[PDB]
């Protein structure tokens, strides 16, 4: 049970070789939605 996890380690490693910080344009699109949301709530407040 220590042995076969210690060899199971390698399959996860090939996947980590695949990006695990990818889809940065999704996150940048969300960030461009939080500037529209921030001001959506200053306009639902209706307060400057």
């Amino acid at each position: 049970h220590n042995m076969s996890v210690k060899a199971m380690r390698f399959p996860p490693k090939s996947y980590n070789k695949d990006l695990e910080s990818a889809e940065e344009r999704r996150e940048r699109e969300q960030q461009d939605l939080e500037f529209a949301k921030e001001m959506a709530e200053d306009d639902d407040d209706s307060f400057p």
Binding site: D42, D45, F47, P48
Partner: protein, 155 residues
């Protein structure tokens, strides 16, 4: 959650010191209170920042939560209370086992989207054989050492 606030002279803001209520604070951004913080942070008050002072004497005080010189290791549960525990678990092992075979035949003949959304009766999979073995074991191992240790300690 704990903030701090200080009102700001709204009059002086109207008079042109509106960009002059900026004292030099650091920052970290808030939102859900933008309700009254859009004229709060930016008209009526602002955000102070909070810290703490973790003394070492207070830390060595709170750190206390167990007086064990009569707890475990000088005790151990009842050995007829402890067999009635094993009985129950190691029977539940059987019940779960069967369903486990029936899951290993299924997963083989299906694609991971249908085993993904499989959230009806979580009693079937690994999750419960692990959930068990780590309570069972624990128990028992130590269940285990407690008896031995006392045999020498109070020899």
């Amino acid at each position: 959650v704990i903030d701090a606030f200080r009102l700001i002279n709204a009059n002086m803001m109207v008079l042109g010191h509106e960009p002059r209520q900026t004292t030099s604070n650091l920052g970290h951004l808030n939102k859900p209170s933008i309700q009254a913080l859009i004229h709060g942070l930016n008209r009526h008050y602002y955000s102070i920042t909070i810290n703490y002072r973790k003394n070492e004497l207070e830390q060595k005080m709170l750190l206390n939560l167990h007086k064990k010189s009569w707890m475990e290791g000088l005790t151990l549960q009842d050995y007829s209370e402890h067999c009635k525990h094993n009985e129950s678990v190691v029977k539940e092992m059987l019940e779960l086992a069967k369903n486990y075979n029936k899951a290993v035949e299924e997963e083989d003949k299906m694609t991971p989207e249908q085993l993904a959304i499989k959230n009806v009766g979580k009693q079937d999979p690994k999750r419960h054989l692990e959930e068990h073995v780590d309570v069972l074991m624990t128990s028992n191992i130590v269940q285990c050492l407690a008896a031995m240790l006392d045999t020498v300690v109070f020899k």
